[PDB]
């Protein structure tokens, strides 16, 4: 836990900053610990335990950031005072202000249950056995195999936050993960690889079986990949990859991008820009859910929000600073858990309905223009012909503009990855451009 | 400094590990501090102060790594014991052994003088003024300019090392840096950018002037860049970029690459593989030189070595572990300061002697095959015609094999960047393939 002594140290640091030149300050005291086991066919163990103090210093109109893990009060006094005096040499930034405290999380909402109480009691030997079991699912199962890697990771994270205009907050969470990565002999010198992983906030809930199996199945499906004719296709995207196309839309909603006139979604608020099938909410208060939180790092209370309602954009993610610069109302600094509205088919069911398409199982390089939304990404996957996967595909690019892409979404699956903070199912888009290279 | 109390804490941790299950251990106690000022035309300050303890644990034939910055002895006892017990669950690795202590640095060599004693006394206001002066060299000097960024960075680093078979060592150093980055209006939507930076171990020695000027000159030279006809050209490379082509050769000398049969230099030791003009030494003992050190992280004493002598490869960089696996003698885990033999012309002088060539002023993506040495890299720069720079060049690739490339080195400059651990001058190669894309 974060102890009473830890809290007193954070409170002492706040007070010291305020008494020695800050009109305002924010203090974070954080700690974490982690274990990593990595296996390849060279067993490796790394463990870490870390704790520190970060302060945001508001000094005569200036704004500075300092952070240390050297926590004796004598050295902290020097470090903080030096930070204050250094910050004052900056040019002032009058937009760096604390949030209105009426906006802060005010406590008392239900336990989000993001911390597995079993964490400290777990036996490292069971952890490394899980990673061994992953690998054993693939090891020796196919001649073409060159290497089978597997991994176990876990961690715990604690944070205690103080803001000088009357915020105090704390969080704690755990995570666990298992993964496989497999490389095989392709044609010629090709050595294709694939992976799978599972994660959870609770050891008891982590899926431990099928991971090596799934990675093997995925890498074997990469055999025979070839280009297909350029032109329009229906694009199907799996849940492992559906979040990828959404990501640049979410970046465009950031207050700093908007403020810096580097967002293709600038001036689109409350406009009907995308498909009726795109409904997306931010759900920060889901219990036992990766991403859940009652406040952001500025102390602002999180709220459920409509991001898209049947294609209408309803939210930007604007923190206090960018709100002040732009002369608009702040919202929250960023999303917490993105939830796309689901349909009534899974990936297989969606594929079965496509006459001429490409299923995208992975993205290979490319980018989007942040101000225009034009995009070009490398893809691999499968051709879809009369509802069936046929030719394995690679060396193609998908191109277009993100807004019209998201305007051409015709279906969503019932198969989001719930252990992600991005709960985005399979997706189907019509009339998408694919070209060779 | 690292204090007597700090040293006692490291010694206590060593003893605790050895008494509670380790046959052998390594302990590092490290600390650092840093300042960053960033300016863009949004003044930013970051400061950090960090200290921690890392241990390598040799437990019943197994080998584990742990690291923490949480240094109360009660929590360290638990952390170390848990690390030991966790490590034991690994598969044993009998090649993880301590070095023969006859190979360790034995002290007493001259002060390398890598720490500027003025560091703690410096005034942050002078630091941020330097960054302001950098930017002022470019600001308002040209209409096409979109943004002028500049930065100041510094740091200090301390390390105290203990190895249970009789090594104790310590190091301390400082660094300072200044940089500029400038973006301009190109043709159409092109927004080309360029940078310059200077660094030194001593504030007094850091070059503070000309940085914004040089960045501006560099970005303006990017205007009008175009492809040129594909074919063979003489390739000239500047000191800002000459190290780039050498880097994959040095990677190929690593013991782990050799051990994993992923090195195109495997089986080339003491062979005449490259140009008479390629002479390269490792010079770990240069005073006041970035990179200098008397030991590596395994405690092994550094030595001057011939890497290439007139094209003959003379060294691999093999640590204790890879030496044991391969059944060969260890050398040192990696290079410290690479010094290429210099010629008697600077870059301008080298360009003046080239009838048909391309000067490479930057690399844009690409890679080399680690096992074969085949390469393809994106380049930009200038066409060289009868000793004069003419057409600005981009959208070309340079391709070939690294061994034959380094066999075609015809000259080296007198202009290495001495503030780098890579002291590599300008370079001239004959008969190099360039192609469009």
TrEMBL record, chains A, B:
Domain Metalloprotease TldD/E central: 119-223
InterPro entries: Metalloprtase-TldD/E_C (IPR045569), Metalloprtase-TldD/E_cen_dom (IPR045570), Metalloprtase-TldD/E_N (IPR002510), PmbA (IPR047657), TldD/PmbA_N (IPR035068), TldD/PmbA_sf (IPR036059)
MF (Gene Ontology): metallopeptidase activity
GO biological process: protein processing
Protein name as annotated: Modulator of DNA gyrase
Organism of this sequence: Bacteroides thetaiotaomicron (strain ATCC 29148 / DSM 2079 / JCM 5827 / CCUG 10774 / NCTC 10582 / VPI-5482 / E50)
Any single Pfam family the record assigns to this protein: PmbA_TldD_3rd
Family per record: Belongs to the peptidase U62 family.
CC terms in the record's Gene Ontology section: cytosol; peptidase complex
Residues in Metalloprotease TldD/E C-terminal domain copies: 230-436
Metalloprotease TldD/E N-terminal domain mapped to chain residues: 26-84
